Amino acid sequence: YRWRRKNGIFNTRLSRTIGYTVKKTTVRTPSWNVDMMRFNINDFLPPGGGSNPLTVPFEYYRIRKVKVEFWPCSPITQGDRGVGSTAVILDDNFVTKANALTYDPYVNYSSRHTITQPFSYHSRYFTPKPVLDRTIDYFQPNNKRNQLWLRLQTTGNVDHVGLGTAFENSIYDQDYNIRITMYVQFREFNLKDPPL
Amino acid sequence: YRWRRKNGIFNTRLSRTIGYTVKKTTVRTPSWNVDMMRFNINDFLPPGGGSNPLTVPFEYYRIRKVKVEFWPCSPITQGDRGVGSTAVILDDNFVTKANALTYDPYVNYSSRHTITQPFSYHSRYFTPKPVLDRTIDYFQPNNKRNQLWLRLQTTGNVDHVGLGTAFENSIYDQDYNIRITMYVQFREFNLKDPPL
Amino acid sequence: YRWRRKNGIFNTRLSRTIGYTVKKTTVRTPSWNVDMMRFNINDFLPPGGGSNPLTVPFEYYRIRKVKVEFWPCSPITQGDRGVGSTAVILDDNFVTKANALTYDPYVNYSSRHTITQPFSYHSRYFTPKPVLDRTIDYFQPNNKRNQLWLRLQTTGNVDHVGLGTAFENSIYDQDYNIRITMYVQFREFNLKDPPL
Amino acid sequence: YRWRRKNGIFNTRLSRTIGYTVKKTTVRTPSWNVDMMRFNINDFLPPGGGSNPLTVPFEYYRIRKVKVEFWPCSPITQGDRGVGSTAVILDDNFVTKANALTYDPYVNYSSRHTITQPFSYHSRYFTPKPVLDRTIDYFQPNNKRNQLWLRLQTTGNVDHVGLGTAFENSIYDQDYNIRITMYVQFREFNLKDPPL
Amino acid sequence: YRWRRKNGIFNTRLSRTIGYTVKKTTVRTPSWNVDMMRFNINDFLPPGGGSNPLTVPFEYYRIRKVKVEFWPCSPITQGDRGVGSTAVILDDNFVTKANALTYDPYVNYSSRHTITQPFSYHSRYFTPKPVLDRTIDYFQPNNKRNQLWLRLQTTGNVDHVGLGTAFENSIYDQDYNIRITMYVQFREFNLKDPPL
Amino acid sequence: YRWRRKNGIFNTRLSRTIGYTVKKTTVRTPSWNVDMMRFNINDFLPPGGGSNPLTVPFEYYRIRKVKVEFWPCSPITQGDRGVGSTAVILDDNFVTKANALTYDPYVNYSSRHTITQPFSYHSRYFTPKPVLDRTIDYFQPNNKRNQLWLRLQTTGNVDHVGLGTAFENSIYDQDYNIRITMYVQFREFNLKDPPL
DNA sequence: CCGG
DNA sequence: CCGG
DNA sequence: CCGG
DNA sequence: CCGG
DNA sequence: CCGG
DNA sequence: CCGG
DNA sequence: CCGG
DNA sequence: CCGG
DNA sequence: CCGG
DNA sequence: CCGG
């Protein structure tokens, strides 16, 4: 029952990069540094110009998958190692941002995938969900056919969600180089062609 | 296409109990007493304590089914019997609360299941729907795979809906003992374990 | 998995009619006249009376299809012909209303179906979508089973969407006689029957 | 042997519109009005902005097909009809532009497709070729696999070629509304994403 | 994938004739006389007249094969015989023109076909290539389907290439009668027919 | 249709080596160092002597494949790691040479293959293309049979193309030892043999 | 010889 | 003749 | 009654 | 009970 | 790693 | 690694 | 690594 | 045209 | 009409 | 229409 098909469909990929810095602490007991992570397409698609407001000429879109990647910045020979946890949060209900917490809150989460620290690579390939209603915080299951479409706005696209972190603090700085790869699916090729 | 599977899924059951009292009237013509019925999970799940805010350690949820039960409180030997009607209302558009109405408004509803009164048992096993937008009042069909998930909030869970009643008035009080059994499906086991 | 079935389902049809007048212009270069088109069921269902607020005794509804028809009003012998375009817009993001634009913006749209002007007939049989959130502008694919239901309100039904036009200006007036046929599917027969 | 495959390939469509005006003449003998037609993608793709110079984020391209369309502007009731000819010219060697020529030069061309005038529609769906060397004027056959790729420049794209016309003059003006639809195939998705 | 077919295709043959004179020398050591050979269609097709500039009414062309023939002019009873070599040079990089060279440079060439001298017949049936870029000197393999087409210019056709010679000097003159047969393939029959 | 075969064909390999030095920077935000990479056979084939101008006795050539190799020079114990990107650029349109750029421009390129830095090995085995026209920047697909041949010039061979880099800056120098292996295919063995 |  |  |  |  |  |  |  |  |  |  249609079943995509050709009506403007253009599956593609997008990626960006950012640094994340887990700081030092004189504390020696196991303490974690919690932080969330949001996804918004405006940080991937820069603005176009003229009658075409975006750089990609399409109207609708829906994010199929996201591949986060924690490419580290610390060396192999770093000591005071640790262990962390990454979990998938599909409702904009993260666990409060904290620099030092006495436990790993994302450890018993069913979507937990362990992190080895501080020199290892960790990746999480999942389906995010959008924030339609913050008061109610609803979202639908993972079904490709009946997944929703969303207008590709110019400046006010909705904040997708889907990941929260908990890194174990250490004496030394644990710098990281995060890469947020996104697998998008656009529709309704809406290019304009004025004269001149 | 996943197809639940194990990722925190915990099907269970919940139940509560309340009294409902259809009062007397000197009127002898057939008159009905209309009233609605709302379902909210906060009335089933009491609050937890500490880092775990709820009593059930899960994040998401979705109500599969509801089984209302009208366990009466009147004896078999009660006279001035009557006949009522229960209907399923999935849009928060009930029929105005009234102590005496000259007709059964929920009689021609396609979801009508007759009530015998005042000493009989009546049950309604159906799928409720949540109230996402009161202005628009939309809801989706009954499909288990693509049913929505909802964040399990602490104090502001959304008011599910799905039943309205119309009991025929009588000279004698018609007390009832309602039992609202709920069949829920949670996800993302999110238990915390601080020290001490 | 139910799979409609009989529970109040009444597939039917509705239609209305309106005039649309593309005006003259002394300009001779190709210039277009852009305009959108919205669909709201209150313009099809007039109000009832008494306990039954609508003319159709049903509670829910969902629009399956819409068939727009541009029955012209100009003769065959009209000169300064042109060419236009109709496109499907499912997000309430039309292209700004304009009396004279130097290009056809809806020409490269994947949902484009060409118009011959000014004496030809043009029809567009498609599935519209409702406006649930204007800020986010989301909508679901075309799937009959899992399509949403909507409460049939009395005065504030939601504005469905799905078509935008671009007619090429001409020296002569290009009057049209638009017919908006709608294919609706109601549910939950909710007729009242007071006495008298 | 690869055989496109996925490496940035995005088949799409582009279109524009222009007026063409065959003027009157007091001459009554059969006389033709010859004119060529060139295709350049800069007239279809407007310029982008910032690090992305174009509106379409791709590097290479190759035009598969072109569909010219002579949507007329004259009425059915126009007299002094005529007959013309359209031919495919793949070498930038057209036949000299002339307002009145005593014969149809594009009539015996093997790629001739007759035009009925002045109120009929005529279309030509063919494969154009680029202008690599004007001195030598070479071009390759129609083979999809081994067709060349071309850099998608910002302001100096090469002038594709492939059509020449010969319309029969008439007492009355024969205005037309030409539509040049292009079927392009891009490659190497080269989008940039600066911060801010 | 078309696969010629009928669209103006006219395979034919052309031929011309010229004398080539290897001169005497008092030298008795083996010495060779090197010379190249170029092919240009203007030496085969004389100019037409009027609107038809050429004698053959076609637009494009591509040379499939060339058959050079060294019909000698010397008698059987000639002494001081020798031995030479003919090679195929597809890049306009011949070996410098020389009246006396101490070796046969075209002897080890893979495309070498020996000549017996001075009274024998020698023929070379090969596919030439055009000179598209002298700086780069590129050419494509022998494939009939994907061979290039070339505009049939009036006075500036491109110089095809493909043969170089090395004849062994002798006391007596070695006159030859060269015949350059060409197997051409035209396209796009472009005949004009003015009145009178 | 010939289908190489023996007519001088000599597939072989060539290789060279060079150092590439990504310098330090006090900047700590993610910044990249962009640089291109060109391939010219004169850097692989040194000049011969005498009548044979090259070291390899052949006339034509065509580069089938190139294998770049980033053999690092930094130790395993180096900190402030990073992440880069290599992409294939077949049109001589690289991304401007820069010592510090706030983003990875070659990240979203379809031909992107990630680099781990600074102690890892990275290789890219691809088919380059030559620079026939800088103004137009055309190139043909990857097809072995119909790939072009090129004259093997002595001092002015054309600059093949096909790779661009983007390395992430770091506090420490990131020296590399690049190896450019080339897989060439020659033709027309053209050796000379003068006396003495 | 003729030769797509 | 070309010839692994 | 129990009910995915 | 619901019932085309 | 995740692990009934 | 080698790679037609 | 790439990933619909 | 009618169109689930 | 749409058209890989 | 194109048409051996």
Q: What would your notes on this structure say?
A:
Chains A, B, C, D, E, F: Its main location: host cell. Chains A, B, C, D, E, F: It is found in: Host nucleus; Virion. Chains A, B, C, D, E, F: One of its GO terms (molecular function) is DNA binding. This is part of a larger assembly, with six copies of chain A (196 residues). By secondary structure, chain A is an all-beta fold. The first copy, chain A, has no helices and 13 strands. In chain A, strands 1, 5, 9, 11 and 13 form a five-stranded antiparallel β-sheet that branches. A five-stranded antiparallel β-sheet of chain A has the order 7-2-12-6-8, with no helix packed on it. Chain A has a two-stranded antiparallel ribbon with strand order 3-4. Chains in contact: A-B, A-C, A-D, A-F, B-C, C-D, D-E, D-F, E-F. Chain A binds chain C through residues 1-2, 6-8, 51, 57, 59-60, 130, 132, 145-151, 153, 156, 158, 187-195, and chain C through 88-93, 102-103, 105, 107-111, 133, 135-144, 146. Strand 11 (149-151) of chain D pairs antiparallel with strand 10 of chain F, so a sheet runs across the interface. Chain E binds ten DNA strands through strand 5, strand 8 and strand 13.
Key words describing this protein structure:
five-stranded antiparallel beta sheet, T=1 icosahedral capsid protein (chains A, B, C, D, E, F), mainly beta, DNA-binding, 6 chains, 196 residues, viral penetration into host cytoplasm (chains A, B, C, D, E, F), viral penetration into host nucleus (chains A, B, C, D, E, F)
